[PDB]
Chains A and B, each alone.
With several copies, the nearest count.
Chain A
Amino acid sequence: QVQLQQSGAELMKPGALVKISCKATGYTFSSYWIEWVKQRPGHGLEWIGEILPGSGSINYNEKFKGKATFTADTSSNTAYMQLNSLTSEDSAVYYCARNHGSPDFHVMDYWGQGTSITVSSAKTTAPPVYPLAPGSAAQTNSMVTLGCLVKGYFPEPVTVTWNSGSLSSGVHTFPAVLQSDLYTLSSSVTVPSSPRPSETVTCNVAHPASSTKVDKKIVPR
C-alpha cells in the first residue's frame, strides 16, 4: 500500500523557478531512493536524477545538472525537485518514482501521479467563441454537422458542452492546441438533418480562469 503523491500543477513565467513535491506513504521514507522523470509530449521519458532522503545521496543526469536540484524533508516525508531558470521547453509532466531496494537496483516500482508544469509569459484572456454553421450549400441527406470554435485564450482549461450535457453522444471535441501563446480549440457535433435547424443546438463554453461563461446557438444560413 505504498504511494507517492505529487503537488498540484503550476504555470510559471519564463525565467522564474518552481518547486515540485512528492509525499511518500506506506514505507520507511528514509530507506528508499526517490526518482525524477521528465515527460514531454514527443520525447518519451527522460531521467533527471535521484535522491536518497535521510543519508542525502544525490545523482544527476549530466544533462540536468544546472537545471534540477533535489532536497528531502524527513519530518515531512516529501522529496522536492526545483527547476531553475525555466524555459518554454521545460513545460512537461514530471514524475517521482520509488527506486526499489537492494534486491534490484534502479527499477522504479511506485510512480507519483505526475505534476504538470507550463512555462509561458502569456497573460489571462477571454476565448471569443464563434458559431460554426454549415455552408449555405444544398441540403445534405442524412446527417448534418455543426461546429464551435473557442479561439485564443489563456490559460487551460475550458469546458465546451452542447446543450449542457443534453447532446453528448455523437460529438467530437478536440485537444486545445497552442497557437502563438494562445490555446485554440474546436468541437464538432453530428445529428440527423431532422433535428437541425428545427432545434436549438448551442455551444456551452466556460473559462474558469477569466470566469467567462458564454453560450452561442449555431444559427443556420
Chain B
Amino acid sequence: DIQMTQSPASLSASVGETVTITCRPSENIYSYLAWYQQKQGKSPQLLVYKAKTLPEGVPSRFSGSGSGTHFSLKISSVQPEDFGTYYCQHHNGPPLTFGAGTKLELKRADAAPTVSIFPPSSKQLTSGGASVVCFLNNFYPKDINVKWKIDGSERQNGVLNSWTDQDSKDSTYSMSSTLTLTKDEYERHNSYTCEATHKTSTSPIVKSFNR
C-alpha cells in the first residue's frame, strides 16, 4: 500500500511569503504525483500533475517538483486566494492513496481570548439537569486548551467542545466548552471555574462563578 507522507500537517504564513509543502511516498512513485487544493466547504481542485506539470487555468506561482520518493509543492507569492487545505496523491495505478493534508493558515499578530463563563438556565434547571457554558472568543495562535474545575477538582467526563475556523475578518478563532451534569450533581457543588491555557497568557486565563 503506498503511504503518502505530507508535511507539515499545518503551515502558517501571510500574503507575499513563499511556502513549501512536501509529500514523501513509502515506495517509489516514479513521477506520478498530483496536488489538489481544497477550500473551506467545497471540493478538491486538480492543481498539479505528473510531479511538475500544471493544468491550464491554475496560476504559475504554484510550482511542483521532485521525483521518486521526495516531492514538493511551492506556492510562491501567496495571495489571499491560496488559503485552505492541500493534498497530494500518487497516480501510479490502484489503489490510489492521498496525503494527510496540509492546512495553510493566514498569519497575524497574536491575540488573547476574551472568555466568558455562563451558568445554567432557569429553563434548563426546570428540565432536570444543569449545563455550564464557556466561550473563548477571538484568539490567534490556533492552539488553546481548557480545564473544567468543579469546586477545585478538575472534571472532563461531561464536557463537549466546538471550534470555529479562522475568521474572514480578523483571522481569529473561537471555542465553546459545555460541561453538562445532573441537576443534583450541580447542586451539591458550589464553585464552577472555566480555566484556559493559551500562548498569549503567561498563565491560565480563568473565569468563574459561585452559586
Contacts and interface: CB of A to CB of B under 8 A. Distances in A.
Direct A–B contact in complex, judged by CB atoms less than 8 Å apart: yes
A111 B124 CA distance: 45
Nearest to A46: B98
Contacts of B116: 134, 145, 147, 188
B133 A61 contact: no
B98 A145 contact: no
Contacts of A108: 36, 44, 46
Contact of A186 (B36, B53, B95, B162): B162
A45 B46 CA distance: 14
A186 B133 contact: yes
Interface stretch (B70-78, B86-94, B148-156, B183-191): B86-94
B87 A186 contact: no
Interface in B142-180: 160-164, 174, 176, 178, 180
Contact of B96 (A47, A109, A112, A151): A47
B72 to A, nearest CB: 18
Contacts of A95: 43-44
A199 interface: no
A177 B162 contact: yes
26 contacts: A45-B98, A59-B94, A63-B95, A106-B93, A107-B46, A108-B44, A111-B43, A130-B124, A131-B121, A133-B118, A134-B116, A134-B118, A135-B117, A145-B137, A147-B118, A149-B133, A151-B131, A175-B162, A175-B163, A177-B162, A179-B160, A179-B180, A186-B133, A188-B116, A188-B174, A216-B123
Interface of B: 32, 34, 36, 43-46, 49-50, 53, 55, 87, 89, 91-101, 114, 116-121, 123-124, 127, 131, 133, 135, 137-138, 160-164, 174, 176, 178, 180, 209
Smallest CB-CB A-B distances: 5 pairs = A106-B91, A130-B121, A45-B98, A47-B96, A145-B116
